[PDB]
Symmetry: C5
Subunit: 147 residues, 5 copies
């Protein structure tokens, strides 16, 4: 029931696992537009190579333009090394810092999964629920409450 | 023993798991009022979508109004992925930062459980103790000591 | 130790969870500072907070109002059925470190992070163990002096 | 897999700070990074500064010191950490990952995480392009260029 | 090949496990002197009770005098509780912050082992290599590069 026709939303997503990323971004956008009246022109969609650059990508963007809310999207899958654990730890803290420093709401749209299936399931495939929808609504709500 | 009739208290809670959240918020409010003489009109109750927004929701509110203490309430349940571990990590650190930056006492009313039953038990259901009561007293005590 | 700090002003903030273990710890710290380091009883402020999570904020608030040469944060955390223990420990350990580095005031880590009650009591000097409160009292005095002189 | 670009950064100034532990793995990584930025992104050899520090723990400080003296559009921190018999591995990794993030966010300069956190030597060499693996240095080089440009 | 005759080095070490600490400190000092031409009178050696005080001990010292590099030395052995894990976590981050805040290179000379034997082995005893030597060279190198 929350409508944000004047909200300016920023979406920065990594490019790793497009098979999972795309469904997530679509869900977020479609949800904001169809269910919250956000205007397509007001949604900026940017990207970075991997999830590690998500924090800096967001900080750089919110320094140039003004946004009411931001959604950081990326997919991390546990591999053979400890890489997964450390990147997740760095990003989860990084996004929190960027949001608290800037005063701009930052929605955590990062999937930290054990395998590909868990990722796709959370992107709405194979009978799962698209988490991007949830993030889209969260962005709108936080955007309005930030006033 | 501690009475804070002039205290202004803020409560920000996530909306995930209302079955557990409500009992927790009720307990906190009721305890502050009935046991600490806090005035109903001096208690602001706000909400955010999920626990990850708890730190930002709080930072934003304590920047607009003045409160003597804040209680951050949310429920996190371990799931199939690593989502639980990283959100918990981020929120626990984020709340601590918001409290130390602002100088305003922040009570940690976050349940980090393995299953729904553990959450409900800690909300006072099924023969358990409502942790919201404890948080309510903690807020009043910290609010007064902050002067 | 042969270090004497008769002019030192010490702050002790402890949580109230597990008084059975907290009291011996605080007593040990106070008695050691007094009997072994010549700290004056009137120069030792003892404050408390509900739980260990409030330890960092309780300390930050106090060192902003008064001046202390050293601070001892005391609390007892016991592993429970949930992940509560792990996250509170994490937040407190980092919070204390930050309060100390921000203020320039030495903060002694008097937090027990145990698996069960017996481990805590044993480290508070009961059942044949050594009272860690003693060590914290001495550490406080040493850091206090090295912070001034 | 990943997802690079065709982006050209002829005016970009890139800094590379690497540890010296495990040169057998470090070298391939640095070469990959450099070669990819040159051959595939048109970065000029003269605009690439390569510096080093003893171990990975000094990576954050080495970077902070350098970006305070000169101006770079992007930085790549490279190092290799192998799990050993103690907890040394876990704590050094934790400190470095957070340290790099802080340096990048404090300075506003993009910092690429070129740190390998593996269980054994084989895993490191494989990710350096040896024994049939993919050289991760290449990916880091493209990431640096892309962030360098987007930082304007 | 690196000589630092004008470098001023600070060594702060804990006093827990002197059996392992001493060889580490000697290794660092002897290496800086015999192999890097650092002058004995330019090496300040201080101490704190335990490893948790390492960060503050260092911050306090580099605020009073000027050093080109600092080496924090301490030994942490896993015990029956979680004490080991949390102290290690706090110190590893603390040192990093002190170094990044001050701009002074800080060498991590902290051993985080499972038992005494592992510590002594890394201090040069029982056929092992003295890690103190490495730290000494690291301090000299970072001190010069800091210019």
């Amino acid at each position: 029931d929350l409508k944000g026709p004047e909200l300016r939303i920023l979406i920065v997503h990594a490019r790793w696992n497009l098979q999972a990323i795309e469904p997530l971004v679509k869900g977020a956008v479609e949800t904001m537009i169809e269910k919250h009246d956000v205007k397509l022109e007001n949604i900026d969609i940017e990207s970075v190579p991997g999830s590690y650059e998500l924090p800096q990508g967001i900080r750089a963007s919110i320094a140039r333009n003004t946004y009411d809310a931001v959604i950081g999207i990326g997919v991390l899958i546990k591999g053979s090394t400890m890489h997964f654990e450390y990147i997740s730890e760095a990003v989860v803290h990084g996004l929190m810092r960027v949001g608290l420093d800037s005063g701009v709401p930052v929605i955590f749209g990062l999937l930290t999964v054990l395998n590909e299936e868990q990722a796709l399931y959370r992107a709405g495939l194979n009978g799962g629920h698209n988490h991007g929808n949830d993030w889209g609504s969260a962005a709108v709500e936080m955007g309005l409450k930030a006033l």
